[PDB]
Structure formats: C-alpha cells, structure tokens
C-alpha cells in the first residue's frame, strides 16, 4: 500500500490483499507436505516439514505469515538478501 498517510496505506494494502489470496495446502493442517528449497531473486528460503509440537522456528516474518495460513509446525532458514518483500 502506497499513500502519503500511514492510515491510508494500511487501508489500501489491507483491502487489496483479500483480492489476491493464495490457497496453501497443508499436510494434516499443521505443516507442509514436503520440504521446500526456493530462491526468489536473491533471497533463499529453506523450509523443513517437521512433526507436531515442533512449533514455528523460523524468521519472525515467516511465523507471522504462517499464523495467517494455518501452518503450526515448520522450520525455515533465510539466507542471501532478507528483503521483507522478496
């Protein structure tokens, strides 16, 4: 969301996001199906499927997004650049 006032950018960002929803399949509704190793531009994310109780042991931005998806047990390490948007 881009605006001159914060509250006007929260609105735009918040409302525009619900029109761009992914569906993230979860294994047993707590983790991911396999382990994911991806590189977006210069950011590397190595995500690991874990059992239950493990919890979200991952970058503070990933735990936030995982809580919004429904993933409850996972590990991820971010390498390379750590641009929040990448």
């Amino acid at each position: 969301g881009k605006a001159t006032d914060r509250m006007d950018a929260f609105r735009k960002a918040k409302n525009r996001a619900v029109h761009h929803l992914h569906y993230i399949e979860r294994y047993e509704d707590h983790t991911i199906f396999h382990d994911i190793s991806l590189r977006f531009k210069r950011t590397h994310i190595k995500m690991k499927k874990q059992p239950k109780g493990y919890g979200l042991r991952c970058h503070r931005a990933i735990i936030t997004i995982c809580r919004l998806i429904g993933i409850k047990d996972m590990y991820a390490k971010v390498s390379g650049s750590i641009n929040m948007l990448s």
Binding site: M7, D8, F10, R11
Partner: peptide, 14 residues
C-alpha cells in the same frame, strides 16, 4: 487489533 481511523471518503454528497 490496531483500529485504523475510518475515513469518511464519501463526504461529498453525490
């Protein structure tokens, strides 16, 4: 939850 002030966007009665 941070409640953002709701702007009265449609001030001008169309």
């Amino acid at each position: 939850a941070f409640v953002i002030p709701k702007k009265n966007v449609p001030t001008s009665k169309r």
